[PDB]
Amino acid sequence: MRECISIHVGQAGVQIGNACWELYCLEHGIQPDGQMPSDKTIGGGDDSFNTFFSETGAGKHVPRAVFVDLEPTVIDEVRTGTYRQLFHPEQLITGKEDAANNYARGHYTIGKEIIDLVLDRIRKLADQCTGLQGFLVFHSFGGGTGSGFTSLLMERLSVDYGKKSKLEFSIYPAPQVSTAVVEPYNSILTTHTTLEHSDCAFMVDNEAIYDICRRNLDIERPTYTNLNRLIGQIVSSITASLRFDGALNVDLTEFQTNLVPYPRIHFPLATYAPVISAEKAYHEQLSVAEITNACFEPANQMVKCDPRHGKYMACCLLYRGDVVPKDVNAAIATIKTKRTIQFVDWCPTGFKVGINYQPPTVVPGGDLAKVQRAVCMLSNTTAIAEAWARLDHKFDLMYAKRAFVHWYVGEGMEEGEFSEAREDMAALEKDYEEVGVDS
Amino acid sequence: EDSLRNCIDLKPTPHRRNFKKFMEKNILRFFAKLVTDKCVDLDRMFVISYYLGDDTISVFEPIERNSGIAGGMFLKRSRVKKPGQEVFKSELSEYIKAEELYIGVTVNVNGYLFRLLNADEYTLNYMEQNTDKYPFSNLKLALQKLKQEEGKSRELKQVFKAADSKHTNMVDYNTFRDILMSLTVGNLAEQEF
Amino acid sequence: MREIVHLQAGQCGNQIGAKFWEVISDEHGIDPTGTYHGDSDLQLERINVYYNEATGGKYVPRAVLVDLEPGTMDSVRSGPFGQIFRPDNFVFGQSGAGNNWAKGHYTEGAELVDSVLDVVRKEAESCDCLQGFQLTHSLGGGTGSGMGTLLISKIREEYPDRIMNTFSVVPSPKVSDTVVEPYNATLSVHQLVENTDETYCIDNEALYDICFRTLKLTTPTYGDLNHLVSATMSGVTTCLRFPGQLNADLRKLAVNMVPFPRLHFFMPGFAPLTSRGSQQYRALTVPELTQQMFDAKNMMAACDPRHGRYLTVAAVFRGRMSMKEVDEQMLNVQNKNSSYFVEWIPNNVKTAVCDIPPRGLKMSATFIGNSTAIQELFKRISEQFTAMFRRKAFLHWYTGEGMDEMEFTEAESNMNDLVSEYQQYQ
Amino acid sequence: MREIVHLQAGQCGNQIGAKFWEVISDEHGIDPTGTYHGDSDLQLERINVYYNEATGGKYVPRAVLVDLEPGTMDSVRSGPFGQIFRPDNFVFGQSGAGNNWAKGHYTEGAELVDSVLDVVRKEAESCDCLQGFQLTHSLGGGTGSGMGTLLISKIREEYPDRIMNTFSVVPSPKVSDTVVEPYNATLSVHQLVENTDETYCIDNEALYDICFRTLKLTTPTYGDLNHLVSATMSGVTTCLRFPGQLNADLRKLAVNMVPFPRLHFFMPGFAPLTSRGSQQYRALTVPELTQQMFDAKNMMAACDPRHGRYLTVAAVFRGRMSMKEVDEQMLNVQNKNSSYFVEWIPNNVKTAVCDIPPRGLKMSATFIGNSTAIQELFKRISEQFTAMFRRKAFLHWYTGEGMDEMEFTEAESNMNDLVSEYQQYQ
Amino acid sequence: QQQNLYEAVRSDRNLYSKNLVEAQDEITDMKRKLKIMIHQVDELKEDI
Amino acid sequence: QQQNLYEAVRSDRNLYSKNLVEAQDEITDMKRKLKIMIHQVDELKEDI
Ligand SMILES: Nc1nc2c(ncn2[C@@H]2O[C@H](COP(=O)(O)OP(=O)(O)OP(=O)(O)O)[C@@H](O)[C@H]2O)c(=O)[nH]1
Ligand SMILES: Nc1nc2c(ncn2[C@@H]2O[C@H](COP(=O)(O)OP(=O)(O)O)[C@@H](O)[C@H]2O)c(=O)[nH]1
Ligand SMILES: Nc1nc2c(ncn2[C@@H]2O[C@H](COP(=O)(O)OP(=O)(O)O)[C@@H](O)[C@H]2O)c(=O)[nH]1
């Protein structure tokens, strides 16, 4: 009766979606073939797979997501790898020529020829499900497909389905390192679409994942194949209350109203804790207070900002595991006592909790330990304006010499969108400072 | 188990669950049917799952075509109390159905009688591999229960040969049932069978 | 006979009504099968008050089970007592509200209200002499507060000469489990004070105070919290179901507790709460019961009666006893606490006794009391609303669904006029 | 009938009271489970004085158990008679007082007395007719001397028309187990002399001397010294809970032994004391008891009574026994030791006779006595205080918690007035 | 310190108010006794 | 604010104690009146 649909865009999206769906296989016990194991001859244990996996009369479970990318090379590893029989032959959309780190190639010239093919399967996955909350978007700012094609996908989806929910997990550019050069162009020019054609948008920074995975899990030199496990661990704790039973359930509609106070303010921030190794797990006791303190600690913060310099507007607790509600209230009443953490004076109740019973599972070869309880943050704070300020300063000095303009003008779009995208943000940063100003 | 601590200690301490048992522990699945008086609406096949972690039983019924009832789930990861009553003022800790489930054992769950009829292949592999807990899966004891009647073992050969009319090694499960109950020993349980 | 119709809306209402329909099934001797398994015969003389009779000697609860998301309906039907509730009594929606009063009251709740009327009007007309209604909901939720307030206004327009009592879940000062609950609750109490006869304010944090301090338990799950709520729910209609020396209905308690149509907010309590180690050493005696009544620790609302003062007090007693120390000790606490009672009305305290105590107990008693100290609850949500509304916070979820800003100002103005006349009787 | 509230503070008060609640449980025939297993019915007619009735026949002791360090209450529950104490009567803090009167009175023992006062007041209203208070502590410590004198102050200002019977274990010079206790002794007798009506001084050197020469035991552990103290604890009030021919309560002892509002410091005794190897060769007679009550060897305070003069003496007898032998020998000891009693008051001796002797004995006699030889008990503390305050040592622990140095001068001034009045009237 | 002093003084104030009520009750009861024996005065005047 | 509350409560406690003292003084005064008219009762009984 409940279903969820995920749309993963770009090379970032198709690579985090592989680790996202292998965990979904392991929570419901789905083998890479696509069924219950043949050792178990009677099944249908609980209809928690109905929201993530389809049902066929032969006993096969098919996922309810779609993968889109303009690069065929990273897509066909799913066709070649272990999970070839599990994923549908149609649910993985393949391009022919990549956008090549550009916005106009992904938007106006190549994004048009495949925007109708995906929408057919989006409609096909929409009438399968009786009840749909909305769509999850796993896209990247720096990618050509994740910027250009997404800036037409969210626009067309908003008129394809009016009041449907729209959640985004965006791979935000890191403030120090980057794999490209023209990523401020790819980041700014897609913000004009996403500020009006999205409901909620969590940001993920890779270099903050780099330090967190290094200093906490005691694993030096990580790889993307384990970062996507961490991001895939975040996605399961959000949708845990939908699938699994809990003391009180949080919907996909519950936190989209409790983290977005203004239509121009829809940028929360994610944080996961505890993140410890197997060797560190058994020495340290893991209390509810000791896992909620690291969440509010800016050292464990997953986007490279500081709430000490900023101020929160809203937060969201995702408690999953062996947790009782008594010390949850003792923890959050203790959080309200420290004056180092500062809230705004107009949102005196900034808490929403969600309780799930089943502790998180672990994967063979993964980095995280077998843990009994965990908590995920979805907090909205104004410290992102610190990150936006240093992103536009780089954008303004890069545009002052009119570099890389010929890569965009000759593709078909006009040069007036460059000035508008800089100005529309400048009003948005003015909106960011005005909500932070108290009475 | 939360309120033991008031007399264990003057100041209570949180109850400590079995970290060891949660750490090593898969799911033991049994086929069951409902047993009451003769009613035509109740011919429903359920599946019982013992989780082996927190010692917990969950019963579910798969959705069946053109049936008048559609019950997706019967119990939600909750422990089962045996029908022995004695609910209040019980000095000992309460009794809970442990993991002792054979084929043919009628289990009384929540007042509803459930007859166990079949086990999953993983469950039967568990039965034959772990036998110190379950003496009903011993092949040696199963054949020792048959060795007590060696006087009729000669006649049993002609009894089998009467069924073997086409000179094959080929007999039915229902036939192999009815000779082993026509022995009328009464000691051949369904699990041993 | 006077039969009670139960209303059960929302996820929070479902989790407390599942426990409510468990203890009176336990008390009346109802097994999870649906039959009766008990010893005496006076448990069956008045069983139609909560149970409808059918073939095979079976009883189903006289309740309607209402929600907008269907996730918790599989939760209710698969619980310990999930096969006694009628399958046709479940009304469910598809698109959940998600902590928004506006969607629950104007857009999402506008269609399911007609279908659940057809359930309740079919059920209510089948009663011989219906006593009244009772309700369980939460103010912080989209379904129980958004659409349950529509049900409150609608069945009041359809059944005028009746009684309806609500076990409302007010927010807590620190435990608060929403960011937008002043928008969810202040407009609910605007629609509540006009169309309600009795209101029991049940707070979560007070239950956490009881279980940690009075009962000395360390892991209070919601199943442990909902028993305390369900204890006082069954504890108010005891004399309705069983004979005694002086019976009392919900109508008889209402006419003694509310003197005016806008003073109908109570503050419940329960006496026999004792910790396990202290169970064997405490003498269960009538002065001991009334000693634990008027203590501010015992109360189920997040208010202090020392800061305010009482107006009316109700006591409903269970168990065969003498009426002497119920009569004598309430006069003593009336005389000792001369400053904690109003002076413009005498004999503020109402007595009710019942013969049968609950299972595993000898004597029990229930506190129902109107007080001015609940203004502290309303003023606390007043300053949270005032410090949020002035800068148009969280407003596009509310002004984008039809209702205008004059509704918000009248939601304040009705509430400030309500606490204005709360001050005057103090 | 006439209930006595027992208060226990400090580690010394907790150990003695744990022995005290053991002897009277044996006297009344109460097993450690909580029931009653005796032969005579006279142990049940007067049972409400020391024990409270609970449902199921279980008897619980009316006592309050207070200490900041929770170390000793683990041993109390682990003792032989520890199951009977109520867990609601176990009130404790978090950190010890650290042998400081400042932390025990004004910083750490200043917020726990709110919790102590509510248990005491709750048990006070549970009694039918309250008779008074008895309390045990130590003056040479931080918790017992600090909160004990604090609780004496707070109860006296709330219950004026009652009595206080303090059993204080005063320090000894050679058995000095602390180096700072001259400060705590002087600063507690200031609060003792103004808010107590009857104070019993107990010493350790006197008890070690008795167990060597009279009882002849070579291993006198604390489990034996507390037994000697607990005998006088149960023998002072044996005419309040047993029949006799000349009954006397604690108020009759107060008006027969306290002539002046400041001369109320006593010296206890108990004298059917024999060794195990000399039981066969002694005649248990009234002359032999009378002989050994009055010698200096049997006093439980480190003072020689022959260096001063008695003012008042009271003796409480137990057993089926005559009266002429009592009246002649109490007259004989006054006539023979005429120089040992003051000549300005006649009939210094008060006699009380009971019916029931304790278990495993034939007759008993409890000695209490006011004397002017307590001058030597307080002169040593004077010289210790003056030589120690002269260089202002051990003082930063006291001035770092709120008290000025002037209170030390006032404590010496009060005590110098107390040794002035005894020497004037000698 | 101010809160402790305020609570203690408030408790003493409530005790004083209760004692004032008790004094009023004694006044009423023994006023009734006074009226009774005033009627006795009138009766003995009629006796004279 | 706590100082103001404590001083107001102290003034109220002093007022209540003063009223109790006044009530006890009235008690003693018409005790004296009661004993005086009791002596009067004795005098006219002697007359009778
Ligand atoms: N965290 C994380 N980031 C990734 C991952 N894969 C790619 N990225 C991000 O993606 C950025 C590169 O852009 P791509 O996603 O490869 O480009 P694209 O979306 O395929 O668009 P085109 O290259 O034009 O086809 C890098 O800077 C990474 O930060 C991943 O597996 N995990
Ligand atoms: N006392 C109590 N409160 C509960 C329980 N379950 C949920 N709540 C409260 O209900 C609130 C959430 O209500 P919600 O589910 O949104 O209501 P709905 O949307 O109308 O179904 C939370 O703040 C909880 O504190 C329960 O079992 N007992
Ligand atoms: N005779 C006797 N003296 C004791 C006993 N327990 C403690 N004391 C005395 O108590 C003194 C120490 O007091 P202390 O425990 O420090 O007091 P507190 O810190 O205020 O609790 C020592 O000098 C001991 O002689 C006992 O069982 N018998």
Ligand SMILES: [Mg+2]
């Ligand atoms: Mg690509």
